[PDB]
Amino acid sequence: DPQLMGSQTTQYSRNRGYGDPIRGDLPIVPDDGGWFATRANPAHHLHTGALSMIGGDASDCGSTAVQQLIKKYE
Amino acid sequence: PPPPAPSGMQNAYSTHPDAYRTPLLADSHALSRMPVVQVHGPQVAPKNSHF
Amino acid sequence: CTTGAGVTSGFIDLATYDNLDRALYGGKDATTYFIKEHYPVGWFTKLPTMATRVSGNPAFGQEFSVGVPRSGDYVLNAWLTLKTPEIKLLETNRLGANGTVRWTKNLMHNAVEHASLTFNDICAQQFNTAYLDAWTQFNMCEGKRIGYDNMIGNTSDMTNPTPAQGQDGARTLPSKNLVLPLPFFFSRDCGLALPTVVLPYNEIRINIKLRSLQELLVFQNKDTGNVIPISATDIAGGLADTVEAYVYMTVGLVSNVERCAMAGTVRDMVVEQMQAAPTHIVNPQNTNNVHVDMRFSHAVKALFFMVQNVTYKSVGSNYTCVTPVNGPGNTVMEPAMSVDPIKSASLTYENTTRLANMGVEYYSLVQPWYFSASIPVYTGYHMYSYALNVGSVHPSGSTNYGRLTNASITVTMSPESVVAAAGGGNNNSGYNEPQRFALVVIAVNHNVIRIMNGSMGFPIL
Amino acid sequence: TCTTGAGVTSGFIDLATYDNLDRALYGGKDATTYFIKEHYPVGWFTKLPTMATRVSGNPAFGQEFSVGVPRSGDYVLNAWLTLKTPEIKLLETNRLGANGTVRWTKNLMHNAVEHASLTFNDICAQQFNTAYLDAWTQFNMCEGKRIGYDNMIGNTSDMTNPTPAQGQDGARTLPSKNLVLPLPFFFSRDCGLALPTVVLPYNEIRINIKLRSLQELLVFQNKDTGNVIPISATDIAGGLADTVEAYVYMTVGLVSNVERCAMAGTVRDMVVEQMQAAPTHIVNPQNTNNVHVDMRFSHAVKALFFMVQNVTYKSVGSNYTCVTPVNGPGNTVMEPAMSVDPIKSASLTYENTTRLANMGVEYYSLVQPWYFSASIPVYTGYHMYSYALNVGSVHPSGSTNYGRLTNASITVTMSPESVVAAAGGGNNNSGYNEPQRFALVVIAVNHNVIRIMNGSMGFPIL
Amino acid sequence: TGAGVTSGFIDLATYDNLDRALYGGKDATTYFIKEHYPVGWFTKLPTMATRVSGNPAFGQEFSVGVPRSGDYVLNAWLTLKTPEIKLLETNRLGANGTVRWTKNLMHNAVEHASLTFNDICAQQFNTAYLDAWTQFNMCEGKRIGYDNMIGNTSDMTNPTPAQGQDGARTLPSKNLVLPLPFFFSRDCGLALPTVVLPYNEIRINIKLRSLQELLVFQNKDTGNVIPISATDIAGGLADTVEAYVYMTVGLVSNVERCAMAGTVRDMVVEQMQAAPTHIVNPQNTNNVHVDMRFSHAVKALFFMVQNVTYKSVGSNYTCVTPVNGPGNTVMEPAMSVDPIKSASLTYENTTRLANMGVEYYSLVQPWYFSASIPVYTGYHMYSYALNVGSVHPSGSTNYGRLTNASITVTMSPESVVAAAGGGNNNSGYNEPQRFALVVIAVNHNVIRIMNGSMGFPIL
Secondary structure (H helix, E strand, O other): OOOOOOOOOOOOOOOHHHOOOOOOOOOOOOOOOOOOOOOOOHHHHOOOOHHHHHOOOOOOOOOOHHHHHHHHHO | OOOOOOOOOOOOOOOOOOOOOOOOOOOOOOOOOOOOOOOOOOOOOOOOOOO | OOOOOOOOHHHHHHHOOOHHHHHHEOOOOOEOOOOOOOOOEOOEEEEEEEEOEEEOOOEOOOEEEEEOOOOOOEEEEEEEEEEOOOEOEOOOOOOOOOEEEEEOOOOOOOOEEEEEEEEOOEEEEEEOHHHHHHHHHHOOOOOOHHHHHHHOOOOOOOOOOEOOOOOOOOOOEOOOEEEEEOOOHHHHOOOEOEEOOOOOOOOEEEEEEEOOHHHHEEEEEOOOOOEOOOOHHHEOOOOOOEOEEEEEEEEEEEOHHHHHHHOOOOEEEEEEEEEEOOOEEEOOOOOOEEEEEEOOOOEEEEEEEEEEEOOOOOOOOOOOOOOOEEEOOOEEEOOOOOOOOOOEEEEEEOOOOOEEEEEHHHHHHHHHHHOOOOOOOOOOOEEEEOOOOOOOOOOOOOEEOOOOOOEEEEEEOOHHHHHHHOOOOOOOOOOOOOOOEEEEEEEEEEEEEEEOOOOEEOOOO | OOOOOOOHHHHHHHHHOOOHHHHHHEOOOOOEOOOEOOOOOEOOOOEEEEEOOEOOOOOEOOOEEEEEOOOOOOEEOOOEEEEEOOOEOEOOOOOOOOOOEEEEOOOOOOOOOEEEEEEEOOEEEEEEOHHHHHHHHHHOOOOOOHHHHHHHOOOOOOOOOOEOOOOOOOOOOEOOOEEEEEOOOHHHHOOOOOEOOOOOOOOOEEEEEEOOOHHHHEEEEOOOOOOEOOOOHHHEOOOOOOEOOEEEEEEEEOOOHHHHHHHOOOOEEEEEEEEEEOOOEEEOOOOOOEEEEEEOOOOEEEEEEEEEEEOOOOOOOOOOOOOOOEEOHHHOEEOOOOOOOOEEEEEEEEOOEEEEEEEEHHHHHHHHHHHOOOOOOOOOOOEEEEOOOOOOOOOOOOOEEOOOOOOEEEEEEEOHHHHHHHOOOOOOOOOOOOOOOEEEEEEEEEEEEEEEEOOEEEOOOO | OOOOOOOOHHHHOOOOHHHHHHEOOOOOEOOOOOOOOOEOOEEEEEEEOOEEEOOOEOOOEEEEEOOOOOOEEOOOEEEEEOOOOEEOOOOOOOOOOEEEEOOOOOOOOOEEEEEEEOOEEEEEEOHHHHHHHHHHOOOOOOHHHHHHHHOOOOOOOOOEOOOOOOOOOOOOOOEEEEEOOOHHHHOOOOOEEOOOOOOOOEEEEEEOOOOOOOEEEEOOOOOOEOOOOHHHEEOOOOOEOOEEEEEEEEEEOHHHHOOOOOOOEEEEEEEEEEOOOEEEOOOOOOEEEEEEOOOOEEEEEEEEEEEOOOOOOOOOOOOOOOEEEHHHEEEOOOOOOOOOOEEEEEEOOOEEEEEEEHHHHHHHHHHHHOOOOOOOOOOEEEEOOOOOOOOOOOOOEEOOOOOOEEEEEEOOHHHHHHOOOOOOOOOOOOOOOOEEEEEEEEEEEEEEEEOOEEEOOOO
């Protein structure tokens, strides 16, 4: 068990880093076929995005609490 | 057989029973001449204890 | 009443108390001064050792390796001592009476490049002149500045030009040994030390490639300020290639109970590495804007850059736009017009201006003032730190360029550098000959090293 | 020669020597050890400078302008001001003719900035000025950055070097180089204290900066008699440009969304440091050599900084000695020999119950900075007395609340050098050729508490 | 133009395994938030120390009692007004004669500075320890201030010619301040519990040095030094002079002064052990070995060879005495190197430290295990601890149970050639030179406070 590449992630696809940074790439399942079908792995083919990586839909802020706060205060 | 044991007192003795020679060294102070090495001191009574 | 040796004066302050003082001080669990909590620490000892040479011979322009000694529980300090030769100028020099010889500025950090540390045959890290200069200019605590500027040369004797024997100045450059510490990950902090007891068979090497002595001495003309390479016939005694260079490392021993407790486990450390971008050649006559792409892998922490004057290969550690000249009193001086070639630098992240066209004074002063332990005293040495404290070994704000898209550093040239690139300058002006510049970029990044079963490696890589 | 030694095994004697004192000091089941550093995770964030949207007028010498702190940042923890000085070119048509030199005053920065304030909504929250800036930069300056500061704030041996008229040997022009002043504030003092603009959406944060007039910024000096007179527009070429470009930059630091939403909707308490400047008092050593000044301070004071400032000429600033600087050889400013701090002794009294006796001036000058500060001034004046163990430490230390204290007094006794400098008649190139005037300025530094709740900031003690 | 805001979102988007290992986590200590904890209530103020014996005079000794009725004593310093020197025209040297204050006026005229508890001595320090500690643990920014406090103003030390010569200036009379390094002054956490020690009487004994050796009388041309006399200068030699001692006293709240009453306490303090100086003659032999006899766990060793040719000049650790220079300014001639070339430590005839170079102790050891590097020749050190200035214990060894050890030094060609005179004018070695090797040790100790009394449990 060499330690030079033990806990090392695989080299990501070149197209992963070209996606939208603000909004993560949409989750689409690939084609696990054998006739002009790409066997892309979403583990290293999809960019999670800046906001989707951390979340945003918390119990208090939840990215939408402002709407019902305004509705209640109105 | 593997290479000799690395330094740091793992190579200062042999595992075979007929030659061990515990790495401890005897003191040079003998027994007749034992230095006092350590002594104890008492608390000093205050100068103005008469008040 | 109030008399000498009074104590009642402070009773007014003691009685002074309100809600603000109750909020700040006081409380059942509040700590107090004048009382120090004492806790036991580990039992250990330390001592220096001489590292026996194992490869090559110490000589200028060649590479030699030194093996790290065993039998020490930890090693946390390493330095190189070198005995400089004796310089004696002769009247048979090519420049005649109008010739002077002196050691280059910053004798140490020179004659030492590609200084590498290898575990078995794995290059853990490597540093060179640019990194040494940047580190010693940015993270040098005061009080030790004089000591460092004395041990690395720069004693106003090596850098003072001396004329030939026939002239008034017939002094010879003294031959005194100089000491240069080796900045390594284990030397950064006492909490990070190499477990040589854990690694009894993983042999460790330090590779040092010295620089040739021809490009260590500056042969400066007195009047026109022209520098030409030195030769054996120029000075008496020739140029002895061999040199007396030795390596010393400080080792430490711990208690038997501590050693047996620590032996037999996996240990993870956070270390700092350097990545130097490939050098670039800048011609201000052609274009006034220079862009260099950065390629880095791990989480970078700071970016150091400067434009180095490469007009004369003998003179080094000169990041100004004009080479130094020989002034009065057998000393070296910087001419009137000598400023950093940088005017404004900016960062671009794939056609996105992450950092605007900030002025050169920003990187020169504001960034070191807030996010560094010192401010450089020489022109150049511009920096940008993603972390609050660069010198802190503990991790701080940092970005991984390996997972980031292409980034470009953009620099605008200065009119002083533009006019200095073309020659025509008068005598003792530095820019008499046409001047060429080079741009160098270095970065410091974080990394994780794992030690397990008497072996080393980089799990992330 | 002969450098072999026993080797690594020599330390085994040091390890073997072990007594009861060594057992009490080192060792133990829970005893900590070096060579191993514990690692703990920290938060995820990124920082970057941003422009500040100024929405009030344009910068100009002798005018006041306000810049609004930009929102959209989780935390702001820095603030500095950049200003590009104009170009100076003296003309032969000056009033003094050949004996006329022009130079920027000492400490170009910390000047042209007075009553710099940071207000929230419409409440006066903080304020500082030239005396506080000078005292802080002289008392709490980390070594190594001193050269950088003295290069970015002026005093770079180029602005302060007098230049004669064009017809004389010295015809150089003062360079027009931009300078940077880092504005001290409670959020800029430490990284642990930052303004939570993310949870402060109901408040307006503004910074007010009032620049000085270029007439008093510049210094016009007589080469022979060493007299200072106000400058005029016709004296220098190109006139006087009242308007000038100036910008306020600040660093914005973000934070992870999980921590942001965790800290959202909670009551926050912060400790900040403010200052109070007592009104200046005119001192005339000709009449009396002893001056007593009352103090009126409100909160828990941490330290008192004072100094007597020479105020003979309003053009020259940051001068706290008895004799104004005069021109010297080599077109460089020269300090006349008879130039010492006018204060000879000082004392503090709490309603006829004195706390400090008639201590010597050297006490406040040297002993107090040596023990209860991070630096020692390299100039004259700048006396301090600190109730706290460490002035620079943001954490509270020993202090006294002046609000719950009756009026206190400070007494200063001047010096024979000051009383003889008060009268004029000095010879040429001596500074005191004309009568000298001095003023007393007192600055105090105090702690305060700031409460953050319901998206607003305010003092819970009023 | 730029982008400003929203530029950092693409930066925050980058997150990998290394970033997850370093940052992140539910227990990560975020910045921008400071945890505040309350502290104790106290108030400090200065206080005169009342003299109890003797009279302050040069060449005498006087003792001052520590003021009582306090809670903590955490400072101590002395102030002394230097006399005014009026050089006369009837001096022995005639026109070719100058008078100046010795270099490092403070740390001179103060020797055997002792602090005693009740009737037993507790600590003692002197000139060599003061100079070494100041040169090795001087925080920058305060270096100029401390220099100004102790003198070295280029006015006291600048030579002044006779009245009729070009230089008519005289040495001004201004007071100087010397802090007293003590265990309670090392850190604020260690202070004398005066509230815990009632009816205990504490002494500070200071012995001054006579004015004959505090004044340097240098020949203008040949650079010779002769002892001064009262008739040589105007105003005589006033032996008596003022000298005051101040110290800071702190007061604490009743809730803690009553709480801490009647409790046993143990404190770790740093003391000084000085081996007797040894005269060294480089003319006969080049190697000088001196034994070291110490008791407790030593932390650091300092040593130096002092030029002792003229008792008038002090703090001279160079083989060549300073001479008068151009511009009425004292200068040190070109031949100026430390006489020590190499040093080694021997443990029971076992060389723990080999024949290391002098530059090692001069530069490498201070660079790693000290807060400062000396700016003057000499002052060699070797420390067993990682940080000398840290009050907290570090690596150290005890000499009480360690059998006799020695330290050996080797001389230098410059020292052996300067030991014999014959040099030209202003060469410094115009007369034969004598040297004395001095070694100081800084160690640890434990002091026990109980029952309103103080003592040393380990003795």
